[PDB]
Amino acid sequence: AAQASVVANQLIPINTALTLVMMRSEVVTPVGIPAEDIPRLVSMQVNRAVPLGTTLMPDMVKGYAA
Numbered sequence: 001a002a003q004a005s006v007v008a009n010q011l012i013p014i015n016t017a018l019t020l021v022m023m024r025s026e027v028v029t030p031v032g033i034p035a036e037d038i039p040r041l042v043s044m045q046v047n048r049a050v051p052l053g054t055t056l057m058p059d060m061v062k063g064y065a066a
Helices: 035-041
Strands: 005-008 023-026
Touching: 005 035, 023 035
Parallel strands: none
Antiparallel strands: 005 023
């Protein structure tokens, strides 16, 4: 039910390091990376362009292991 995931708050370009303005949290389905992990994701890079409103999934972040 209400487990929130990290959702792109703006288009995140390929190979760009994540900053806090890029990530909001929302209850979406399917469930992506948990909102609690946003501190962890800061400065990690995405391996693909992530369009606005996309749920960030573990396989989109280089080096992410939960």
